[PDB]
Design a protein around this nucleic acid. Structure first.
Ligand code: MG
Ligand code: MG
Ligand code: MG
Ligand code: MG
Ligand code: MG
Ligand code: MG
Ligand code: MG
Ligand code: MG
Ligand code: MG
Lengths: 94, 158, 79, 137, 119, 47
RNA sequence: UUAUUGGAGGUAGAGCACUGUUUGGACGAGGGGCCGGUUACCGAAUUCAGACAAACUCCGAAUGCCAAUUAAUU
RNA sequence: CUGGGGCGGUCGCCUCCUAAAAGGUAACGGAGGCGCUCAAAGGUUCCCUCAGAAUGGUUGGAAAUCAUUCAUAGAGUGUAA
RNA sequence: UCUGGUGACUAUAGCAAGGAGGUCACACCUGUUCCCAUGCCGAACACAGAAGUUAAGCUCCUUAGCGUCGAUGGUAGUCGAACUUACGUUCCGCUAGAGUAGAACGUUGCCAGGC
């Protein structure tokens, strides 16, 4: 429940999104209680291992910059061909 | 029996319909004026001759061809005709229960049937050439049939 | 031997809008040409016999919504 | 032998073929399924041959679903005819698949039986296929 | 059961169908009529600005008696034309509300014609 | 369903042209219409 | 020709809210096994999930179109 | 006219689709209608608001008609869309 | 500010549910003598009334249950460009529908009355 994130900068183009997915990274956003919209980056391999040990519906304490937020998972877009996760939405709860 | 909070809040009857039925007039046009004369003898109002609303097949029907009759009784004419139907019907019928155990539509309707037996309670069988039937509905201010069962028990044979 | 039974069509009628929003018009000019009433008339706009919308006075033309999903045309005075 | 009972228009334009699957690309009714990898038409004789070869291998065990129905008629003009004197009479009924679409779903059987039953069906379709599970996570 | 509908919400459906060709334009203003059960009201309106101009009433203390409910309505029509005589005593448009032009609405309109207005 | 002519009593000529069918209105219909010779309305009857 | 503003319209894509098409599963009413009813079967209705459309649309682009600005270049 | 010509079929007008979100746009491309009617089915002034479904009710062809609750037009709108 | 009359605004304004409110306004309510009225019914409409009642309409609170509104981010599609003939790929602009967070149990002009 200790996953790490990296804040994306402004205005990702088309190229640097697919260049980000040819690494092991996946784009993401966080929103909800007490926060603002922050768009982030998560490793794919690390994200699967956290889900497979806390379940589909569990609490993740991930860190954005300095602070850490208790975060649940809202939805995710999946590519059924070539079977990789392509977007993940995060929801803060408190 | 209900412990009403205000005397303005109490159930009461509103209207009674005297709609007869079809009387399918392929050749009964002279009987239709007599069926109008039967309702004008039964009730004290010239009934509205309710015509058809379609032209459906396999029947003697078209757009028009008046196939009904109904008269509305609301006031003292409803108050006077309800008292005579309380007495000169059940003695002229001689049934066990009299109407039904439950004939409301969830709202408090009587919907009692007739088969030309208590009809013509004034004149005897002198000019009548065919059987008929009436439908006496009771529109009231009852919310449900269980509250209407307290209203139907007063001068009723449930 | 084969043949067909579809060759018919009507001549097309040049429907649609004829003036633009923000344009100055003269006091009798046709604004919109339609079957039925896709656009209602508003201020200083008449509605013809074949549902043609036209201007009463001369001015500038404004298209504008009417309710949730209805549209109208108006003509306002000063130019 | 699948075909609709009545259609409003017997003669129709042919469907658009390029692109990706619009929807219906996750297994929902069963446990295992067969998804497509290239693009083709499936002409309602292929999914009769494929459903039979599916069924006799499983010895009437678990259930089988078909996610494809042939909706669109196609026509063909008769033998040795000049071009253009109207559009010909109907010939058959097709359904269009694009890469992603699930074709069949099976359930109620072990996994290695499901791989072999779907492999026998896949040699009767004109499209490259692939064996998939019920996705989670 | 039996549902009685209130009379006022049926009136406004009838009133909105009337007031679609009719408006007050400040050369030709609009007077509408509202009667409740015990009083009669009257009010001049310019619909173009949405600003009213004059007003008279049955419950006003200047005109308060127990005449007929109809001779009451006549006194209102005499009252509203005097304040209409101060400015805009020209032609107006009579808005009948949603009522039949009959009885108490009609007696209000006759009093307004017989006291200077030009409708 | 035929063509039909209304004519004035004293308007001089036969101006107005209407239609009817004979099965529904076999009679000679008549109206009050305008002939500008007299600057008023006058009875015009079917010929 | 471009920048900025304003507007008309229903394509691509998506979707099932109407019209038609369709796959499974439930719900119960009817006929319906029977000895009138069970149970099986039938069709119809209502719901859950999931698909299709040139002559379907609760939605709806990019571009193109019409215009106006003491705008800027030609 | 004609995917050679003949045989076959068609030749004027209206409405949809093709038609590529202005308008316009072809093929022996796909679907249908017209060669009228109405003396009120016209004008004006006042009133009214449906089909359908559900539930009750002699005739009940299941549904004709009656009462009741909902019902965005699904009704109806002379005649195709 | 409270009540009423009457206008403006894409239901964020609606629908449902729960609770309070009244002789000042409003309404149920009383009656058919008169104007007027019902394909029959003073139900409706019209008129004459003020005994009764806050039960209902109405108004004020409470709720996000249905409807409505609705980003951010990602994706589909696409103008232009560059490779290519693949049911295509790459770059750059624009940017949906669906879905999620959330909004929301109206806002406001004029007059009269009651404050
Ligand atoms: Mg789907
Ligand atoms: Mg499409
Ligand atoms: Mg096409
Ligand atoms: Mg389409
Ligand atoms: Mg175009
Ligand atoms: Mg066009
Ligand atoms: Mg023809
Ligand atoms: Mg009364
Ligand atoms: Mg969106």
């Amino acid at each position: 429940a200790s996953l790490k994130s990296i804040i994306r900068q402004g205005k990702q183009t088309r190229s640097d999104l697919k260049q980000l997915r040819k690494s092991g990274k996946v784009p993401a956003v966080v929103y909800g209680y007490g926060t603002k919209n922050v768009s982030v980056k998560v490793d794919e391999v690390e994200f699967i291992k956290v889900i497979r040990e806390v379940g589909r519906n569990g609490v993740i304490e991930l860190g954005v910059g300095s602070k850490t937020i208790k975060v649940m998972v809202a939805d995710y877009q999946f590519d059924p061909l070539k079977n990789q996760i392509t977007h993940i939405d995060f929801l803060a709860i408190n | 029996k209900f412990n009403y909070s205000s005397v303005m809040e109490v159930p009461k009857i509103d209207k009674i319909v005297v709609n007869m039925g079809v009387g399918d007039a392929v050749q009964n046009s002279k009987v239709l004026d007599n069926a109008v004369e039967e309702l004008e003898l039964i009730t004290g109002q010239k009934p509205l001759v309710t015509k058809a609303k379609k032209s459906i097949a396999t029947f003697r029907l078209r757009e028009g061809m008046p196939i009904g009759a109904k008269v509305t009784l609301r006031g003292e004419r409803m108050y006077e005709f309800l008292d005579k139907l309380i007495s000169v019907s059940l003695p002229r019928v001689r049934d066990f229960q009299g109407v039904s155990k439950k004939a409301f539509d969830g709202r408090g309707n009587y919907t009692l049937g007739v088969k030309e037996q208590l009809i013509f309670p004034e004149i005897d069988y002198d000019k009548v050439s065919k059987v008929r039937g009436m439908d006496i509905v009771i529109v009231t201010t009852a919310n449900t049939d269980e509250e209407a069962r307290e209203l139907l028990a007063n001068f009723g044979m449930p | 031997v084969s043949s067909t039974k579809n060759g018919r069509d009507s001549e097309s009628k040049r429907l649609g809008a004829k003036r633009a929003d923000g344009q100055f018009v003269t006091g009798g000019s046709i604004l919109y040409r339609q079957r039925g009433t896709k656009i209602y008339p508003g201020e200083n706009v008449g509605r013809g016999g074949d549902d043609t919308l036209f201007a009463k006075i001369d001015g500038v033309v404004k298209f504008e919504r009417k309710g949730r999903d209805k549209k109208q045309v108006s003509v306002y005075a000063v130019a | 032998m699948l075909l609709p009972k009545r259609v409003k228009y017997r003669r129709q334009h042919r469907p658009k073929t390029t692109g990706r699957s619009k929807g219906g690309n996750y297994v929902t009714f069963g446990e295992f399924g067969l998804q497509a990898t290239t693009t083709s038409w499936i002409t309602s004789r292929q999914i009769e041959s494929a459903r039979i070869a599916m069924t006799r291998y499983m010895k009437r065990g678990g259930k089988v679903w078909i996610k494809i129905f042939p909706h669109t008629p196609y026509t063909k003009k008769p033998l040795e005819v000049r071009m253009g004197a109207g559009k010909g009479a109907v010939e058959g009924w097709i359904a269009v698949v694009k890469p992603g679409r699930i074709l069949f779903e099976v359930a109620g059987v072990s996994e290695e039986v499901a791989r072999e039953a779907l492999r026998l069906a896949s040699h009767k379709l004109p499209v490259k296929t692939k064996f998939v599970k019920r996705e989670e996570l | 059961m039996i549902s009685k509908i209130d009379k006022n919400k049926v009136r406004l459906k009838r009133h909105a169908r009337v007031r679609t060709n009719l408006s007050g334009t400040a050369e030709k203003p609009r007077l509408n009529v509202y009667r409740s059960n015990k009083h009669i009201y009257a009010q001049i309106i310019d619909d173009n600005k949405g600003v009213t101009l004059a007003q008279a009433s049955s419950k006003d203390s200047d005109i308060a008696t127990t005449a007929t409910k109809v001779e009451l309505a006549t006194k209102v029509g005499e009252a509203i034309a005097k304040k209409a005589a101060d400015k805009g005593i020209k032609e107006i448009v009579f808005d009948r509300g949603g009522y039949l032009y009959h009885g108490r609405v009609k007696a209000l309109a006759e009093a307004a014609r017989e006291s200077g207005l030009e409708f | 369903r035929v063509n039909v002519t209304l004519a004035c009593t004293e308007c001089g000529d036969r101006n107005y042209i209407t239609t009817k069918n004979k099965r529904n209105n076999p009679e000679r219909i008549e109206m009050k219409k305008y002939c500008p010779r007299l600057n008023k309305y006058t009875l015009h009857r079917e010929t």
